[model samples]
Target chain A: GPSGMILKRAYDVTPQKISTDKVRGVRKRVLIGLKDAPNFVMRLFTVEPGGLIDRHSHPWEHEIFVLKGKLTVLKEQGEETVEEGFYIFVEPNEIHGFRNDTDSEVEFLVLIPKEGGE
Target chain B: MILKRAYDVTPQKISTDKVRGVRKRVLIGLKDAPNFVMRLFTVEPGGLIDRHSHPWEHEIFVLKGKLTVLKEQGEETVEEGFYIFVEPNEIHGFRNDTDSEVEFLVLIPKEGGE
Candidate 1:
């Protein structure tokens, strides 16, 4: 069988220490593959309570899913409460960030494109 | 509208980031009214993942994934393909506990009959 070529693959987090300045919670990432997906990327993120992810803007679009715990997404429109089993999508160049506000840790997945580079 | 619902949705993986614990990917997910979540996660080698429990019964299935899961009661070995169902209050946990990353999907849904 013929399959597509896989460019770069990072199975685990190379750098053990993660910076909390941008986002206050810890995150672990596993990369599947980078091929024709010039505009998109996929990652799994687990955030602890009180963890704050700063608001920022990018040229590409974004989408998120709350797999576990409670996550509050802050955007220009206001704040939206997203818990387990919830989905959120942000259009291109939309400014937004996420904050975990529960006793337990919240783990979710995020997808974004390469911005204008895409 | 009728009591039943029908909609067309597609699960797309758009982007990724590398930080700390595990490589989480948005395998597939959809939203309409009564929401449902389905995600695929890949655990890094030598990574000891989280140990916790939720209200919903987690459906962890392995599709071209690998890893071993440790629960409060016992331990189970997962290979490239397998699935295990855990009910609430089971006090379950997971650890890539191997040289290769273990991948699986964690399924959660609203309070409705499926």
Candidate 2:
């Protein structure tokens, strides 16, 4: 049902809670991904308190928008925590990750090639 | 800054058709992007876009308030964080039924716009 022209609300999409050895307390919603979007995947990632996404990389770049709270971006250059209303562009093969060091939760939108949506 | 504040960008008023109180901002432009051009559309109260369809697809994300999406199939209202994907040639448009301004992001392939 997600295929073709679709209207999916944040409350409608099933949330995939990620709690792995490398990742923790992160909620992800593949807003438009997989075979739906042709060129890119749009995702919503909400990191809980003390949550973190370990350093990782892929061949595709990332276009991210911070929706709420302070999201600490870990990059090769340095770490920077950006607030809401901010956008970040991560280059391909660039070492980067994310963390919510603040007490509150952090919500952000991520865009990448369909191949990297995995 | 690679990490840019979205509001810092300038907004351009787009007035056409019977449209009113609408502004647009190119967040991720063609020359600056690899695959897509990201644009932000803000519609003030009572603002509406004429129902129309294009040859290119659209990936939309609502940023604020409630937006009334009009489609030939049916109409739906969605709020912040809602994502809508419109296939090519689909008849669709937008309106702000609420009192406050509604903003949404529209991502399209670079070739579609520029």
Candidate 3:
């Protein structure tokens, strides 16, 4: 009875749309809630073609894996395109964003630790 | 300077005899990671990772095929698109009794003091 563990399908969770003047066509699904998770929160982001996530900086580091389509990551220094099966590590305080310029939608998993309960 | 793309990291066969027909690839290692380590495991039919327990918990996502997870409660078949969270110190193991190969991603925190 000690295990707070669970098994669920990703599509079962509803997605929240993320929209801004500068960023468009993005939806996020909280796959795992924080209450049960000890170290990290897992989220799935779906960016439609031509969609972009605005450049931003966060205090917590990010560990991401590309699940489908391709993503163009924009950082302070430059940008790079990552495909499925690729992993991306974003250190703390690093300014970064993502864009889906391909014909299909881009989906990826984002893992971030709960820093100072942020 | 913010991203590392490891496209060709070779997967090595699990040498521990307790596990058979299993291979693992370290997608993201612990050296530069601040909190967690991510690994990809591939198990052929009839392969299994021996029953084991550890202090750290596991967050797993099934990528392909199916796997039967053995736990204290019982055994369950987890297939693609399913997520599994195993609590700390819980007795657990994995088996690929299906005909297809099973691949999944396992993540664990890099907690100090083991």
Name the top TM-score candidate. 2
Which sections of candidate 1 miss by over 4 Å? A1-17, A33-39, A114-118, B1-114
The true-structure Cα RMSD of candidate 3 reads 2.5
Please give, for residues B10-38, the per-residue lDDT of candidate 3 as tens digits. 88888576788898878767776778878
* Top-DockQ candidate index: 3
Global lDDT scores for all candidate models: 0.53, 0.83, 0.80
Ranking by lDDT: 2, 3, 1
Q: Model 2 segments beyond 4 Å from truth?
A: A1-4, A19-22
| Each candidate's DockQ | 0.04, 0.54, 0.57
Docking class of 1: incorrect
Q: Grade the docking of candidate 2.
A: medium
Sort by DockQ, best first: what order?
Answer: 3, 2, 1
Error of 3 at B56 (Å): 1.6
Name model 3 segments beyond 4 Å from true.
A1-4, A20-23, A116-118, B1-7, B112-114
RMSD of each: 14.9, 2.3, 2.5
Model 3's TM-score against the true structure = 0.89
Q: Chain B of model 1: TM-score?
A: 0.67
